[PDB]
């Protein structure tokens, strides 16, 4: 049987009722090695963990993608006025920073 924190009770024949109560001793260690905290909060709070990891992965993916997008647009906006000149003498500091030729 599955016993939660809200209680559980059985009666075995002519015996009196036995009530039982679950308490929060989940398998894992919540203090380090971050694949151990995820199993701990998965056996502890199963529904909330998948939603939390989904929204944290989504925000991390959107943030890394938008930062790469803005950095590539700013590199293009820097190097384009020095790549339309027919001599193309890009200076040295922008060559080291913007990773030019």
């Amino acid at each position: 049987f599955t016993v939660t924190e809200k209680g559980w009770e059985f009666v075995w024949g002519n015996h009196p009722p036995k009530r039982f109560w679950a308490q929060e001793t989940a398998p894992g260690n919540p203090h380090g090695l971050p694949h151990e905290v995820i199993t701990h909060y998965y056996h502890r709070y199963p529904m909330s963990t998948i939603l939390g990891l989904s929204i944290c992965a989504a925000i991390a993916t959107v943030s890394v993608a938008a930062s790469t997008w803005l950095f590539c647009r700013s590199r293009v906006a820097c190097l384009t006025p020095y790549r339309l000149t027919p001599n193309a003498r890009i200076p040295f500091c922008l060559a080291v920073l913007c990773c030019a030729r």
């Binding site: 209680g7 039982f20 109560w21 925000i59 943030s63 700013s74």
Partner: protein
């Protein structure tokens, strides 16, 4: 002094609080609920039992013809049979071959054991909650049956307490109830006069001694065997016995929230649902002044034991200094820790050892002792039992067990991405301004 609070609807567990008048001594209040009933308004309709087909002796006339004289007994069948040559032990009964006549007459009456073996069909609605509180307000304790409608006060020592109505109108009992043998069932019994043959209520006596019972038991008289004096019938079996053979289990074993159904008043017990609000009309005489109670100076709190078990598995230790030796209240204003005792008796330079209960992994609460606030901080550890035989003595706060390591993983992988996007936005702004500065040249 009007003080309102709220108590959870759960027996056995002591509920503690204090009242802080802004310039006086704190007044501790303790309420421990013992037995919380729920008594519906119960309305008897009918009882039922086993029936007992009574049969009159066969009226026999030799070379004659009988008639059917009714009696208006319940389900009273009667029929007249012709062409009968009955026998007694001392030979034949008539001399006529044909044109003899035997009358069968049967009726339904209720059984002889109806008094001690019957089932009561009721109707219930609009229950009434009633608790056995054990209140202590300023070391003056009473034990009184309070009623928990929004009125009907309990009065003691000038203090008026009105424990208001439950936050939920839930009852375990349905609109219809059958009581049999000390146990109570949610059965949809048919109405009086609607009793069907072969099922519950084929007999419907209005009370136990009503002497007017409705009976619909599918009784049909049959023709007697040639040469015998008997009354043969054929009816559907006892619907009360067939109800007893099926009998989906009692409400004692099936009730939600763990109720405890009892019999002699039909009532439920200790249904852990809802919450009782409270009103305290406290007179001004009980508020003792400040300087008639001890008051600490230079106190400090440390945690000896800290286990986030179900009961009082934490010990905080307070080293204090105060220039009196008396008792004073302790309380935790948040629901972070649930203390065990409500008062601590003090020396002038000793230490205090309190017992609290908590769900937190890193407990940081602000203990209120006599009139001051210390901060008790530590780290709790998981308990050794998976399953205990007592309920919970604390409240699971949302974000209670978040374990500072995981606070660090949520701060870095979610706040650091914001740092990435703001330095990307700053870099984009500086690039746009530098492109506009380069095209200022013409």
């Amino acid at each position: 002094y009007e003080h309102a609070t709220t108590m959870p609807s759960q027996a056995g567990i002591s509920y503690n609080t204090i009242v802080n008048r802004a310039g006086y001594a704190p007044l501790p209040i303790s309420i421990t609920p013992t037995k919380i009933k729920l008594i519906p308004t119960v309305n008897l309709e009918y009882v039922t039992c086993h029936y007992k087909t009574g049969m009159d002796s066969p009226a026999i006339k030799c070379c004659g013809s009988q008639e059917c004289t009714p009696t208006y007994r319940p389900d009273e069948q009667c029929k007249v049979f012709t062409g009968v040559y009955p026998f007694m032990w001392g030979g034949a009964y008539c001399f006529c071959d044909t044109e003899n006549t035997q009358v069968s007459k049967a009726y339904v009456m209720k059984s002889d054991d109806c008094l001690a073996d019957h089932a009561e069909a009721y109707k219930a609605h609009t229950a009434s909650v009633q608790a056995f509180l054990n209140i202590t307000v300023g070391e003056h304790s009473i034990v009184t049956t309070v009623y928990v409608n929004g009125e009907t006060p309990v009065n003691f020592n000038g203090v008026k307490i009105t424990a208001g109505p439950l936050s939920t109108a839930w009852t375990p009992f349905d609109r219809k109830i059958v009581q049999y043998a000390g146990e109570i069932y949610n059965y949809d019994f048919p109405e009086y006069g609607a009793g069907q043959p072969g099922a519950f209520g084929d007999i419907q006596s209005r009370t136990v001694s009503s002497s007017d019972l409705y009976a619909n038991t599918n009784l049909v008289l049959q023709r007697p065997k040639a040469g015998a004096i008997h009354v043969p019938y054929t009816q559907a079996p006892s619907g009360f016995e067939q109800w007893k053979k099926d009998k989906a289990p009692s409400l004692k074993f099936t009730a939600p929230f763990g109720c405890e159904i009892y019999t002699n008043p039909i009532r439920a017990e200790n249904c852990a649902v809802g919450s009782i609000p409270l009103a305290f009309d406290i007179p001004d005489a009980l508020f003792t002044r400040v300087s008639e109670t001890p008051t600490l100076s230079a106190a400090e709190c440390t945690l000896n034991e800290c286990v986030y078990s179900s009961d009082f598995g934490g010990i905080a230790t307070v080293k204090y200094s105060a220039s009196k030796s008396g008792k004073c209240a302790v309380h935790v204003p948040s629901g972070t820790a649930t203390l065990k005792e409500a008062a601590v008796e003090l020396t002038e330079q000793g230490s205090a050892t309190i017992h609290f209960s908590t769900a937190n992994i890193h407990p940081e609460f602000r203990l209120q002792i006599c009139t001051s606030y210390v901060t008790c901080k530590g780290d709790c550890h998981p308990p050794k039992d998976h399953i205990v035989t007592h309920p919970q003595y604390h409240a699971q706060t949302f974000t209670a067990a978040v374990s500072k390591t995981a606070w660090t993983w949520l701060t870095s992988l979610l706040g650091g991405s914001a740092v990435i996007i703001i330095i990307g936005l700053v870099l984009a702004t500086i690039v746009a301004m530098y492109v506009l500065t380069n095209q200022k040249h013409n």
